[PDB]
Amino acid sequence: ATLLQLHFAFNGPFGDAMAEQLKPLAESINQEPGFLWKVWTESEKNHEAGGIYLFTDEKSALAYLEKHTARLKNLGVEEVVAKVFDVNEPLSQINQ
Amino acid sequence: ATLLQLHFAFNGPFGDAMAEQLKPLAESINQEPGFLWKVWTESEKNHEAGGIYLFTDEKSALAYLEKHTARLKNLGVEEVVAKVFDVNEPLSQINQ
């Protein structure tokens, strides 16, 4: 599997306000091909947000990354910090 | 719930070789205070490795980060790129 980790400068909303505002966005991610799950990350303290995504394959993950990076611009995000990694299943299974 | 995202330059082992080698390490992590789960990440083509961790609280996450970043020096890992984030539960539940 492929893990996508992303974060970026963000000035809010955070917490329950973020959940309410970005609910539609979250639901749309579920319709993405190859998508398995996502953990939403946020740090009001450091003014940043992002997410950890698990995709079935790298191609699916890269396609989403490019698209989401474009979309993020509509929220005022000019730079996205992201890394694409392979997941080590054996080790991950032990720690889950 | 606090999420820890870490990665760093790495020269190996990778894949099953990594799974066999670090298996003992994965078992000890399960014993760490406040530990919930970890996803092992790796990229042989980019010569990098790391992990995504979930801890019950920030102090537990920060305690482990301090301990782990120090231990990694033994594997030759001089520097580590780390980020500590809060998790948005509502949105994360939608995407799982």
Curated annotation (Swiss-Prot), chains A, B:
It is an enzyme of class 1 (oxidoreductase). InterPro entries: Dimeric_a/b-barrel, YdhR. SUPFAM superfamilies: Dimeric alpha+beta barrel. Its EC number is 1.-.-.-. PANTHER family: MONOOXYGENASE YDHR-RELATED, PTHR39169. It comes from the Bacteria. GO terms for molecular function: oxidoreductase activity; protein homodimerization activity. NCBIfam families: PRK11118.1 (NF008333). It comes from Escherichia coli (strain K12). One of its GO terms (cellular component) is cytosol. Keywords: Oxidoreductase. Homodimer. May function as monooxygenase and play a role in the metabolism of aromatic compounds. This is Putative monooxygenase YdhR. Pfam families: ydhR (PF08803).
